[model samples]
Target: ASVVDVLSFREPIEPENVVRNYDMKGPIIVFENYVQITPNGIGKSSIMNGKYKVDLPSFELQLKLNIICKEKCGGGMGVWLTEEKLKEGDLFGAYNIYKGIGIFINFEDVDIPMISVLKNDGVDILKYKPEMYYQCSVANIQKDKDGAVLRIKYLVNEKKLIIEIMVNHINMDCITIEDIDIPPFYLGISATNGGSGSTSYRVQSLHYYEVG
Candidate 1:
């Protein structure tokens, strides 16, 4: 039906030293979705506009977005931290994990069995508690000249986090096709933990195809 772009974010910090990290460049097309996160500290009423990017070196990825406060008018926000902060009180290298933000594309049915898998196998399927991070998995992914198709399951660990994504059929020119039903869709979760915290999210097991 409607054409949608996919989004993904990653951190460039070394595994041993996570606090000293940077956002990746370029976006990944594993699936079509949108990610949104709120800022931390004094700017409680602000939102961050981030873009996805890929990193050739270190094989790291990240999101490049602007953090603008809703209340603060000027002063250019604040200065960047010099070093990574590993301790609790330190703000350096702290990632803002969206609590319960995730969505599925094209799939129209809400009762898909994959939804149950996420709820059962996911880290925090149904605790009603807040977490610092989230994860999602897709199975039976198929791509072709017609477009891409897949099944998605979401595991959210935050309260205010939300992910929205869409997929559309495309022609040979890579342009999206407008009239197509039975597209893939997804069922997601919304947990807690959308602030300064150390967490990780990942997607894998991709399957691709060629359009006839």
Candidate 2:
């Protein structure tokens, strides 16, 4: 039997101030997903930890996730799955404690364009130079799940940007083995310091299990 759970994260601050809130939208964002676990005497107390390989659809990006134990500890409890960039028509491997590992099989990358908007006049502007506008960070992630939710927190210290991203609501069965070549991760965009400072973000609360 497999146990299913839904995780959700809510932002307490204005979304426009957060590093991942480049769209000027409100701070509240929600994501919901389910996880399937194998039936074993391992018991819920044994601690569950594993890694899964994800091929995102739409945008071609290969990601390795470390599903950390969530029941044993608090605060410091989580996984550190590795993420790597892959080329087109490449084979990426999957991570699992049993059945060894899954082959990369097939893959592709999607190109997303960057748009510029003037804050003074709210007009759409296009400039070819990298330094033509303010500072920003673009993240592309791929997962084998329905949808992964993200929450970002920001703190500024005189021309410096610090941000933290929390992953919530991971729905399993969103991406099947057949969709291996598709992108599974969500795209996050953020800016800080009136678009004049560097921005940083990190992901946590990542969990994954097999769908049988």
Candidate 3:
């Protein structure tokens, strides 16, 4: 299999590099190192792009990003890979009812943030408990330089999805889930802030590759 470029935006991101939605809340800041998906304020926002569907059984997606959550950051954010494009709504600033996968980084536990992997079949996400959950105590992924890195490898032939997270260049235990089949879908990211707190979600770069 040959690798394909699904989406790519390096440093000094341009306007053409990303598509902003009118419904998206807060300013979408494009910094030298990263692009803020949602500003550090009390609001909800979402951004998505995938004009064409890539029909690939096996693929790898990489994202270099950062999440700045303070003591009162009560809401959460999500990296979505879904059968349909994301819509503005509840769950992580996107619709609660959706088909596909959501990698949610929850800040409900302010002292110790956790990441949850939730897969849905056109159902409401809020009612379902997280199928795959991991408690991550890593604080502020981008304190200095080198932000957090996330790698997601989906192997349809092998019937599994591997998720790896690296915080400040330190790799965490890889999470693998089997017996999963995801259809070709759009990719998006979103974030939400509670009335009592604020947070910002940013992405530096994203790369997608298809492998045999």
Candidate 4:
């Protein structure tokens, strides 16, 4: 079973799904049919951590995000799944990859936009291979209704992790985490537009599921 938030306005969202202050007005920056994670105009940012707390230590999963980048695209956005609730201070850093495991989508690299997975306290960054870094066309992503997607699963027998950029058929990366730690992954978005243009991240169709 799964709970999906379309990432739009709060009129359809329930109180149980509410963070009260953040969900009510603009932290999520809702528009016609989607919601966004930007600076929130305040020093703070907005996070939609799994509607409720989940308790699980092991599971392979997939995350799909339909998003677009605008303006200068300075800070970029990330989807995180961590053991603990993230502190606001974590989001203010250069990028939003300081937590459990985060897959970041960046538009700042004008030459080659990228979507990468980082595993660390932001001390070390990991990009699959050269082929898996940045190949998704921004215009194609925005132009296509499906947006962009990142899916990952573990190989119990092989002891390896498989991550794929689902938007492109031929794009996938596999790795072996030194020590695999299974934790209940909380899915959410943290956006920062530190500088440059408006660079907003609008998310639609929040989907998460377990695989083998």
- How well is each residue in 33-121 modelled by candidate 2, as lDDT tens digits? 21211111121111122222443212111122222222221111111112321111101111112111111111112132111211111
Candidate 4 TM-score, true structure as reference: 0.61
What's the ranking of the predictions by TM-score, best on top? Answer: 3, 4, 2, 1
Model 2 / residue 150 / CA error / Å? 3.3
| RMSD per model, one decimal | 18.9, 20.9, 3.3, 6.4
Candidate achieving higher TM-score, 1 or 4: 4
Q: Which candidate number has the best lDDT?
A: 3
- True-structure lDDT of candidate 1: 0.21
Task: Give residue 97's error in model 2 in angstroms.
Answer: 50
Per-prediction TM-score to the true structure, in the order listed: 0.18, 0.19, 0.81, 0.61
Q: Candidate 3 local accuracy as lDDT?
A: 0.69
Flag regions of model 3 displaced more than 4 Å: 1-4, 20-26, 69-72, 128-144, 195-198
- Residue-level lDDT tens digits of model 4 in 162-189: 5555554334453335345435545556
Ten-residue stretch with the least lDDT total in model 4? 126-135
- Point out the worst 10-residue segment of candidate 1 by lDDT: 74-83
- In model 4, state the lDDT of residue 4: 46
- The best candidate by TM-score is 3
> How does residue 106 of candidate 2 score in lDDT?
11
C-alpha lDDT of all candidate models, in order:
0.21, 0.20, 0.69, 0.48
List, residue by residue over 118-149, the lDDT tens digit for candidate 3.
88888665787644443344455445257777
Kindly report which residue stretches of model 1 are placed more than 4 angstroms away from their true locations once superposed. Answer: 1-22, 25-97, 104-126, 129-141, 149-212
